[PDB]
Amino acid sequence: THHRHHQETHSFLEPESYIGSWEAPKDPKDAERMLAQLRRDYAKKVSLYRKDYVHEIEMLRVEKQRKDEARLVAERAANEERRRLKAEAAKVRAEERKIFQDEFRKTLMKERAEKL
Amino acid sequence: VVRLRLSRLGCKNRPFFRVMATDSRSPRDGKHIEVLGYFNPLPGQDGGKRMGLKFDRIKYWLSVGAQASDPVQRLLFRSGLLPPPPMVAMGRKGGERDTRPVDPMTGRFV
Amino acid sequence: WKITVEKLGPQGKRGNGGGWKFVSLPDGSSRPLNEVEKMYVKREAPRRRRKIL
RNA sequence: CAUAGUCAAAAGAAGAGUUUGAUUCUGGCUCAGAAGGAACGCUAGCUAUAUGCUUAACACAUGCAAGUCGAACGUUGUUCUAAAAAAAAAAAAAAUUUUUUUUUUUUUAAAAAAAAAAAAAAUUUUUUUUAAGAGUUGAGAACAAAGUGGCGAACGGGUGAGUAAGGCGUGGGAAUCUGCCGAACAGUUCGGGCUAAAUCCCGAAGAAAGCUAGAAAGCGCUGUUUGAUGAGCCUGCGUAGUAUUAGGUAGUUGGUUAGGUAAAGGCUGACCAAGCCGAUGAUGCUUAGCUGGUCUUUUCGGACGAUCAGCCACACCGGGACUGAGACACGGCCCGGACUCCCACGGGGGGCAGCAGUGGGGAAUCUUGGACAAUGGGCGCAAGCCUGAUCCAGCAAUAUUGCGUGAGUGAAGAAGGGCAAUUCCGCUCGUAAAGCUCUUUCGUCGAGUGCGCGAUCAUGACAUGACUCGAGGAAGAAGCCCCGGCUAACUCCGUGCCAGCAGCCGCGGUAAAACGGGGGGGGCAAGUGUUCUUCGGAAUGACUAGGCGUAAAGGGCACGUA
Numbered sequence: 076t077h078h079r080h081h082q083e084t085h086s087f088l089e090p091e092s093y094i095g096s097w098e099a100p101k102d103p104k105d106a107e108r109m110l111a112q113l114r115r116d117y118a119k120k121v122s123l124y125r126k127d128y129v130h131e132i133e134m135l136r137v138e139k140q141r142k143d144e145a146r147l148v149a150e151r152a153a154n155e156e157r158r159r160l161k162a163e164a165a166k167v168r169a170e171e172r173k174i175f176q177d178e179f180r181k182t183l184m185k186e187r188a189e190k191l
Numbered sequence: 192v193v194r195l196r197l198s199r200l201g202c203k204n205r206p207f208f209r210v211m212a213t214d215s216r217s218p219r220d221g222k223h224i225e226v227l228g229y230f231n232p233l234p235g236q237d238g239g240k241r242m243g244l245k246f247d248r249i250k251y252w253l254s255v256g257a258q259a260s261d262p263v264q265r266l267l268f269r270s271g272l273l274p275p276p277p278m279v280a281m282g283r284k285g286g287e288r289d290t291r292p293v294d295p296m297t298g299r300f301v
Numbered sequence: 302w303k304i305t306v307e308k309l310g311p312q313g314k315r316g317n318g319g320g321w322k323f324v325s326l327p328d329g330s331s332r333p334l335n336e337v338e339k340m341y342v343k344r345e346a347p348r349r350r351r352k353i354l
Numbered sequence: 355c356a357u358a359g360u361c362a363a364a365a366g367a368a369g370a371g372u373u374u375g376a377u378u379c380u381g382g383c384u385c386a387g388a389a390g391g392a393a394c395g396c397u398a399g400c401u402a403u404a405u406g407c408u409u410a411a412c413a414c415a416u417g418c419a420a421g422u423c424g425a426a427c428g429u430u431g432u433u434c435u436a437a438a439a440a441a442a443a444a445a446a447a448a449a450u451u452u453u454u455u456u457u458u459u460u461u462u463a464a465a466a467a468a469a470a471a472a473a474a475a476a477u478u479u480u481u482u483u484u485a486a487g488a489g490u491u492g493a494g495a496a497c498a499a500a501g502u503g504g505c506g507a508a509c510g511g512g513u514g515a516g517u518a519a520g521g522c523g524u525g526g527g528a529a530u531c532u533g534c535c536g537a538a539c540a541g542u543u544c545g546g547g548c549u550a551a552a553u554c555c556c557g558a559a560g561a562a563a564g565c566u567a568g569a570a571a572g573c574g575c576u577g578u579u580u581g582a583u584g585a586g587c588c589u590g591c592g593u594a595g596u597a598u599u600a601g602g603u604a605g606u607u608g609g610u611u612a613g614g615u616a617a618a619g620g621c622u623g624a625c626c627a628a629g630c631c632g633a634u635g636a637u638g639c640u641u642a643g644c645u646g647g648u649c650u651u652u653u654c655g656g657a658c659g660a661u662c663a664g665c666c667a668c669a670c671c672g673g674g675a676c677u678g679a680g681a682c683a684c685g686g687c688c689c690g691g692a693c694u695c696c697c698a699c700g701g702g703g704g705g706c707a708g709c710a711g712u713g714g715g716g717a718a719u720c721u722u723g724g725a726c727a728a729u730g731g732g733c734g735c736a737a738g739c740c741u742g743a744u745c746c747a748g749c750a751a752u753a754u755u756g757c758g759u760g761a762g763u764g765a766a767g768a769a770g771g772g773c774a775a776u777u778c779c780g781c782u783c784g785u786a787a788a789g790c791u792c793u794u795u796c797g798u799c800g801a802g803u804g805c806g807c808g809a810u811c812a813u814g815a816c817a818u819g820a821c822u823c824g825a826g827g828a829a830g831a832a833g834c835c836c837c838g839g840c841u842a843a844c845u846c847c848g849u850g851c852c853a854g855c856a857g858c859c860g861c862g863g864u865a866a867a868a869c870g871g872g873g874g875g876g877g878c879a880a881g882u883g884u885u886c887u888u889c890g891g892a893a894u895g896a897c898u899a900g901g902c903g904u905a906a907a908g909g910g911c912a913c914g915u916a
């Protein structure tokens with residue numbers, strides 16, 4: 076996301092000594108066995124890399140889960156306060172409404188009696 | 192099997208590659224799960240080649256068992272996401288290379 | 302060949318302009334960018350303006 | 355500090371001619387623009403990248419387009435030979451031997467080292483024949499030679515016939531399965547059968563299957579939990595024309611109960627009810643694959659759905675299932691049909707809408723090419739082997755804001771052509787040409803390096819290319835339409851309502867700027883015209899953005915359903 080995180084926390088690596096490490100044997104059969112062992116070692120290293128990546132993704136998922144839960148509980152707390160404030164305002168407005176409606180009803184009752 | 196492989200882009204005699212996460216049965220330039228990056232097989236003005244990868248998505252696909260193809264194994268070793276392929280231990284073929292210098296701007300012998 | 306490996310996605314960004322880059326030499330080692338390579342990085346970024354002149 | 359910072363996401367809005375004696379209005383016709391999978395005429399230098407049977411889903415000669423694995427398994431038959439390690443270079447015709455250390459067995463408790471014929475020596479040696487269903491014959495090479503078995507031939511590739519909603523676009527769901535691939539756990543035991551065997555088939559437990567001390571803790575298989583990827587099933591919304599088609603349905607709509615399916619379900623047997631769909635257009639008829647998108651356009655719309663990619667459907671025409679993780683399967687099987695090729699006449703065989711290619715139809719659409727070097731895919735532990743996927747060459751101005759066909763100078767203003775009271779070198783072709791100087795892009799010719807590059811551990815079809823250097827000589831490279839108005843560009847001769855021209859208005863009946871030729875000129879330019887087709891102009895179906903007194907157009911007038 077930023078230059079500093081990448082520039083500090085990148086594993087820059089040394090030269091790899093595996094490159095050019097083959098020594099030619101005197102028997103083609105032994106050479107084939109040596110190449111087969113090299114393929115098996117490559118499979119083992121790939122499996123270790125897969126396990127490392129599984130653990131990295133799991134830790135990132137756990138962190139995202141706890142962050143989302145924290146935001147959710149903060150949001151719920153804010154909504155629980157907003158709801159109670161609006162309920163109090165609605166209650167005082169409904170209490171103000173009744174006197175006006177009673178007076179208006181009395182006015183209309185007087186008008187109907189006059190017309191009758 | 193999910194495969195990290197190379198799709199051909201570019202034009203005729205100007206190859207360019209994209210690094211893809213695909214089902215193996217898919218056509219080479221057809222259906223895919225994800226574009227993971229790119230690779231330029233032609234050398235540029237800086238004297239080297241270019242490559243971009245989505246490192247976290249490549250880690251995701253390798254963690255769930257995707258299998259890289261033969262050039263993608265080399266490209267992922269070169270970026271540090273995979274171990275070196277078994278054949279890089281053999282070393283390079285030698286021989287007398289023509290080391291006579293050519294001018295960078297004009298291509299003629301200095 | 303040396304390569305120049307860019308990190309793509311939102312988690313590989315060096316900032317507004319692209320992703321972070323390293324070199325990865327043919328011997329198996331990787332290194333940060335040179336000054337010439339830094340100029341190459343700077344000249345290929347997209348510019349957030351119309352073409353003046 | 356900094357590989358920081360910068361906040362861009364459009365442009366696109368034109369009018370003209372033609373109804374009248376003239377006018378304004380209404381209203382059509384036509385024109386200037388952009389474009390195409392185009393076709394045809396005339397004319398053509400080059401490179402590159404795209405595109406190239408739109409018609410007959412017409413019929414197809416020929417070659418190729420799917421195999422691979424001996425590390426699953428026997429089988430027969432080919433060859434050749436009768437213990438391991440190390441050294442042999444120097445004095446008095448030469449491949450195979452001598453020396454040193456380990457090791458199996460035999461012979462007389464330490465040492466020594468199959469039968470028959472012919473010959474030699476005192477039991478051994480030399481040569482030859484048969485050895486080897488044989489008191490374990492010791493190594494080796496191919497076995498492809500033919501098979502059984504696994505995996506893949508459900509991918510990739512082609513076409514758009516059908517399909518108007520069982521499809522597609524978009525968003526969801528529950529009642530399912532999922533080979534190979536990643537990650538845990540448990541097992542991998544014993545009999546029989548296919549002439550011989552098995553990782554083939556059957557049986558028992560609990561499901562199975564073994565190979566490799568050549569691949570011995572490496573593969574493989576089975577069961578159970580999972581991730582990942584696919585697949586099946588369902589569904590909301592959106593998605594033609596036609597009412598000069600008004601009713602349609604009878605497993606139809608629902609219920610119950612059995613069956614079937616991996617899985618919900620009238621999916622279907624039986625029984626029961628009479629429902630369900632329809633004027634918010636069912637059903638009938640016609641047309642059509644859908645989408646991303648392509649062309650056009652001041653936004654909207656219209657036309658199209660060809661290349662490419664996603665989804666679907668189909669594979670000579672109909673009908674089926676089998677095997678399989680997956681098919682009701684383009685290059686698999688069975689059946690029926692039409693057509694066709696062999697037949698020894700009993701009977702067999704085939705399916706280019708894979709890549710090339712051929713007939714045919716058509717105005718019209720390409721090579722019977724090269725390589726698996728790259729990328730992708732199948733099989734294999736690999737080595738590899740396949741791959742008309744692809745990559746790359748070939749043909750075609752079919753397309754593309756590309757490049758070139760020279761740059762200067764030159765007055766005998768040459769010759770020649772055209773016009774001319776026949777004005778100013780009489781005017782013009784015309785500085786035009788020729789000549790002279792310079793530069794050689796593109797193309798041509800001759801060479802040279804190649805881990806230049808595509809590809810790297812290695813492997814290069816392209817490549818007779820490219821690159822670099824050299825030779826040469828303006829040399830090899832300009833047309834097509836038009837010139838009465840719309841519309842930029844005018845004279846002479848011929849013709850005489852003829853021959854002809856024409857997008858529209860109109861020209862031609864003896865001085866035609868309109869027909870045809872000469873001369874000159876204008877626009878585009880390796881193109882340029884003509885035809886077809888789409889949008890624009892067209893506010894000419896008007897949402898944006900029009901109307902209905904007298905021009906097309908208020909229903910004769912109400913009442914009322916949606």
Ligand SMILES: [K+]
Nearest residue numbers: 523645664665
């Ligand atoms: K789709």
Ligand SMILES: [K+]
Nearest residue numbers: 668669671672
């Ligand atoms: K059919």
Ligand SMILES: [K+]
Nearest residue numbers: 726728729741
């Ligand atoms: K290949």
Ligand SMILES: [K+]
Nearest residue numbers: 394751881882
């Ligand atoms: K033409």
Ligand SMILES: [K+]
Nearest residue numbers: 759760828829
């Ligand atoms: K010339």
Ligand SMILES: [K+]
Nearest residue numbers: 912913914915
């Ligand atoms: K009413």
Ligand SMILES: [Mg+2]
Nearest residue numbers: 372373374381
């Ligand atoms: Mg009139």
Ligand SMILES: [Mg+2]
Nearest residue numbers: 407408513660
């Ligand atoms: Mg076609």
Ligand SMILES: [Mg+2]
Nearest residue numbers: 422423503504
């Ligand atoms: Mg087989």
Ligand SMILES: [Mg+2]
Nearest residue numbers: 507683685686
């Ligand atoms: Mg098949």
Ligand SMILES: [Mg+2]
Nearest residue numbers: 508509683684
């Ligand atoms: Mg198929």
Ligand SMILES: [Mg+2]
Nearest residue numbers: 511512661662
């Ligand atoms: Mg195609």
Ligand SMILES: [Mg+2]
Nearest residue numbers: 514643659660
């Ligand atoms: Mg199509």
Ligand SMILES: [Mg+2]
Nearest residue numbers: 596599635636
């Ligand atoms: Mg209808």
Ligand SMILES: [Mg+2]
Nearest residue numbers: 514515516642
């Ligand atoms: Mg059709």
Ligand SMILES: [Mg+2]
Nearest residue numbers: 594642644659
């Ligand atoms: Mg459509």
